[PDB]
Design an enzyme around this catalytic site. Sequence first.
Site, PDB file in Angstrom:
ATOM      1  N   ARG A  82       0.812  -1.201   0.000  1.00  0.00           N
ATOM      2  CA  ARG A  82       0.000   0.000   0.000  1.00  0.00           C
ATOM      3  C   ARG A  82       0.852   1.259   0.000  1.00  0.00           C
ATOM      4  NH1 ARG A  82      -5.550  -1.045   1.644  1.00  0.00           N
ATOM      5  NH2 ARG A  82      -5.671  -3.172   2.571  1.00  0.00           N
ATOM      6  N   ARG A  92      -4.241  -1.697  -1.867  1.00  0.00           N
ATOM      7  CA  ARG A  92      -3.060  -2.465  -2.251  1.00  0.00           C
ATOM      8  C   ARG A  92      -2.835  -2.324  -3.770  1.00  0.00           C
ATOM      9  NH1 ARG A  92      -3.066  -8.830  -1.801  1.00  0.00           N
ATOM     10  NH2 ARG A  92      -2.188  -9.001  -3.923  1.00  0.00           N
ATOM     11  N   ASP A  95       1.134  -6.886  -6.396  1.00  0.00           N
ATOM     12  CA  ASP A  95       0.880  -8.290  -6.466  1.00  0.00           C
ATOM     13  C   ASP A  95       2.171  -9.098  -6.616  1.00  0.00           C
ATOM     14  OD1 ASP A  95      -1.916  -8.064  -6.436  1.00  0.00           O
ATOM     15  OD2 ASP A  95      -1.815  -7.440  -8.550  1.00  0.00           O
ATOM     16  N   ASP A  97       3.192 -13.098  -7.119  1.00  0.00           N
ATOM     17  CA  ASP A  97       2.608 -14.413  -7.343  1.00  0.00           C
ATOM     18  C   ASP A  97       3.734 -15.411  -7.657  1.00  0.00           C
ATOM     19  OD1 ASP A  97      -0.597 -14.298  -7.592  1.00  0.00           O
ATOM     20  OD2 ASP A  97       0.265 -12.483  -8.452  1.00  0.00           O
TER      21      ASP A  97
HETATM   22  N1  LIG Z   1       0.692 -19.297  -7.005  1.00  0.00           N
HETATM   23  C1  LIG Z   1       0.123 -18.406  -6.198  1.00  0.00           C
HETATM   24  N2  LIG Z   1       0.749 -17.211  -5.852  1.00  0.00           N
HETATM   25  C2  LIG Z   1       0.202 -16.280  -5.034  1.00  0.00           C
HETATM   26  N3  LIG Z   1      -1.065 -16.473  -4.470  1.00  0.00           N
HETATM   27  C3  LIG Z   1      -1.712 -17.686  -4.814  1.00  0.00           C
HETATM   28  C4  LIG Z   1      -1.192 -18.699  -5.666  1.00  0.00           C
HETATM   29  N4  LIG Z   1      -2.018 -19.754  -5.825  1.00  0.00           N
HETATM   30  C5  LIG Z   1      -3.055 -19.418  -5.082  1.00  0.00           C
HETATM   31  N5  LIG Z   1      -2.941 -18.194  -4.450  1.00  0.00           N
HETATM   32  C6  LIG Z   1      -4.001 -17.576  -3.540  1.00  0.00           C
HETATM   33  O1  LIG Z   1      -4.446 -16.447  -4.247  1.00  0.00           O
HETATM   34  C7  LIG Z   1      -5.005 -15.460  -3.241  1.00  0.00           C
HETATM   35  C8  LIG Z   1      -4.705 -14.164  -3.997  1.00  0.00           C
HETATM   36  O2  LIG Z   1      -4.703 -13.268  -2.866  1.00  0.00           O
HETATM   37  P1  LIG Z   1      -4.851 -11.639  -3.341  1.00  0.00           P
HETATM   38  O3  LIG Z   1      -3.513 -11.264  -4.054  1.00  0.00           O
HETATM   39  O4  LIG Z   1      -5.186 -10.765  -2.109  1.00  0.00           O
HETATM   40  O5  LIG Z   1      -6.026 -11.512  -4.369  1.00  0.00           O
HETATM   41  C9  LIG Z   1      -4.221 -15.822  -1.952  1.00  0.00           C
HETATM   42  O6  LIG Z   1      -5.284 -16.021  -1.092  1.00  0.00           O
HETATM   43  C10 LIG Z   1      -3.463 -17.118  -2.208  1.00  0.00           C
HETATM   44  O7  LIG Z   1      -3.712 -18.089  -1.216  1.00  0.00           O
HETATM   45  N1  LIG Z   2      -1.505  -5.792 -17.275  1.00  0.00           N
HETATM   46  C1  LIG Z   2      -1.782  -6.492 -16.021  1.00  0.00           C
HETATM   47  N2  LIG Z   2      -3.075  -6.627 -15.930  1.00  0.00           N
HETATM   48  C2  LIG Z   2      -3.599  -7.393 -14.685  1.00  0.00           C
HETATM   49  N3  LIG Z   2      -4.985  -7.489 -14.389  1.00  0.00           N
HETATM   50  C3  LIG Z   2      -5.394  -8.136 -13.262  1.00  0.00           C
HETATM   51  C4  LIG Z   2      -4.482  -8.642 -12.326  1.00  0.00           C
HETATM   52  C5  LIG Z   2      -4.711  -9.355 -11.043  1.00  0.00           C
HETATM   53  O1  LIG Z   2      -5.255 -10.760 -11.262  1.00  0.00           O
HETATM   54  P1  LIG Z   2      -5.693 -11.820 -10.256  1.00  0.00           P
HETATM   55  O2  LIG Z   2      -4.912 -12.010  -8.976  1.00  0.00           O
HETATM   56  O3  LIG Z   2      -5.882 -13.191 -10.887  1.00  0.00           O
HETATM   57  O4  LIG Z   2      -7.214 -11.431  -9.759  1.00  0.00           O
HETATM   58  P2  LIG Z   2      -7.654  -9.904  -9.333  1.00  0.00           P
HETATM   59  O5  LIG Z   2      -7.389  -8.920 -10.451  1.00  0.00           O
HETATM   60  O6  LIG Z   2      -9.105  -9.852  -8.991  1.00  0.00           O
HETATM   61  O7  LIG Z   2      -6.843  -9.464  -8.091  1.00  0.00           O
HETATM   62  N4  LIG Z   2      -3.121  -8.350 -12.630  1.00  0.00           N
HETATM   63  C6  LIG Z   2      -2.570  -7.738 -13.757  1.00  0.00           C
HETATM   64  C7  LIG Z   2      -1.135  -7.534 -14.043  1.00  0.00           C
HETATM   65  O8  LIG Z   2      -0.275  -7.944 -13.286  1.00  0.00           O
HETATM   66  N5  LIG Z   2      -0.743  -6.883 -15.164  1.00  0.00           N
END
Ligand SMILES: Nc1ncnc2c1ncn2[C@@H]1O[C@H](COP(=O)(O)O)[C@@H](O)[C@H]1O
Ligand SMILES: Nc1nc2ncc(COP(=O)(O)OP(=O)(O)O)nc2c(=O)[nH]1
EC number: 2.7.6.3
Length: 158
Positions: A82, A92, A95, A97
């Site tokens: 944030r 927030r 991200d 992942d």
């Molecule tokens: N490969 C991954 N990397 C990061 N989060 C993951 C993954 N697979 C599942 N998740 C779940 O995805 C959710 C995404 O959380 P958020 O970024 O707040 O939307 C978390 O609750 C994680 O437990």
């Molecule tokens: N160009 C771009 N577009 C995106 N749109 C959505 C999400 C996030 O996706 P996800 O976690 O699957 O679900 P949510 O958007 O609802 O948080 N991330 C990006 C990104 O990283 N780059």
Amino acid sequence: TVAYIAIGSNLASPLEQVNAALKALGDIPESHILTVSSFYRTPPLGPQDQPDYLNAAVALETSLAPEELLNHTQRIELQQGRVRKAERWGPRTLDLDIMLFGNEVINTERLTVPHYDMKNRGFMLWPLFEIAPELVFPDGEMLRQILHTRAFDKLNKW
Ligand SMILES: Nc1ncnc2c1ncn2[C@@H]1O[C@H](COP(=O)(O)O)[C@@H](O)[C@H]1O
Ligand SMILES: Nc1nc2ncc(COP(=O)(O)OP(=O)(O)O)nc2c(=O)[nH]1
């Protein structure tokens, strides 16, 4: 084990947030950064009245367990994700992942590895491809093959 981590930030000016995130990733215990991709600028999914994203891929060497690694990336999201807006902490905008974890397949309540939708997202595939062009997924698919098949355009750098 080599873990690949995707970084996205849709702050209007995300460079410092993304760099703070990268340093934080570099401080995770039992782990070290091997390589970081270029920074790319991508339009967001859904409506286009939203800020673009900065996306990048990180290769992290780690002896943590997958779900421990996830504890750390979620901690970083909570601590650095944030930016402080005038009256308050903003939404927030960071991200982190886990795209791949060694050659492992993971399907738990918390973790889906390979990342559940990366094959649909050039903004995840292309940064990965820059740092691991020869990558093969646990099931035998190839990163090159997915990009060749879907023909996602190459991304613009930040
Ligand atoms: N490969 C991954 N990397 C990061 N989060 C993951 C993954 N697979 C599942 N998740 C779940 O995805 C959710 C995404 O959380 P958020 O970024 O707040 O939307 C978390 O609750 C994680 O437990
Ligand atoms: N160009 C771009 N577009 C995106 N749109 C959505 C999400 C996030 O996706 P996800 O976690 O699957 O679900 P949510 O958007 O609802 O948080 N991330 C990006 C990104 O990283 N780059």
